[PDB]
C-alpha cells in the first residue's frame, strides 16, 4: 500500500509512515537505507526489488487564536507543522 500512513513490516523491519516511489538506486546487496542520526529513510521491496522512500505521516501542534472571551467567543485554529489542505 502506497501514499498512506501505514504500519509496515519489511522482512522484520517494523515502522510507521507513508511510502513513496524513490529516485535513489541501492547496490544489489543493499536492503536498508539509513540517513544521519540512524533514521531509516528507504527500503527495497523483497517481492519486487523496488526502492521505496519512507517518511513519517504528518504531526504537529495546535494553537488557538482568540480575541478574548470578554469580547467574543469566536476561535481560530492553527495547525503548525502541516498543510491541512491534505490533513
Amino acid at each position: 500500500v502506497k501514499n498512506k500512513c501505514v504500519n509496515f513490516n519489511f522482512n522484520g523491519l517494523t515502522g510507521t509512515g507513508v511510502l513513496t516511489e524513490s529516485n535513489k538506486k541501492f547496490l544489489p546487496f543493499q536492503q536498508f537505507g539509513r540517513d544521519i542520526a540512524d533514521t531509516t529513510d528507504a527500503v527495497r521491496d523483497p517481492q519486487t526489488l523496488e526502492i521505496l522512500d519512507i517518511t513519517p505521516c504528518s504531526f504537529g501542534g495546535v494553537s488557538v487564536i482568540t480575541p478574548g472571551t470578554n469580547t467574543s467567543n469566536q476561535v481560530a485554529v492553527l495547525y503548525q507543522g502541516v498543510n491541512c489542505t491534505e490533513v
Binding site: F59, G60, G61, Q80, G81
Partner: peptide, 23 residues
C-alpha cells in the same frame, strides 16, 4: 550567500521575514 546551512521536535519560523528586516 556567505553564511548558509523528527521525533516531536520542530522549528517555529521567525515572526519578521528577511524581506521586512531588509525594509
Amino acid at each position: 550567500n556567505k553564511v548558509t546551512l523528527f521525533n516531536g521536535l520542530t522549528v517555529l519560523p521567525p515572526l519578521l521575514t528577511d524581506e521586512m528586516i531588509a525594509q
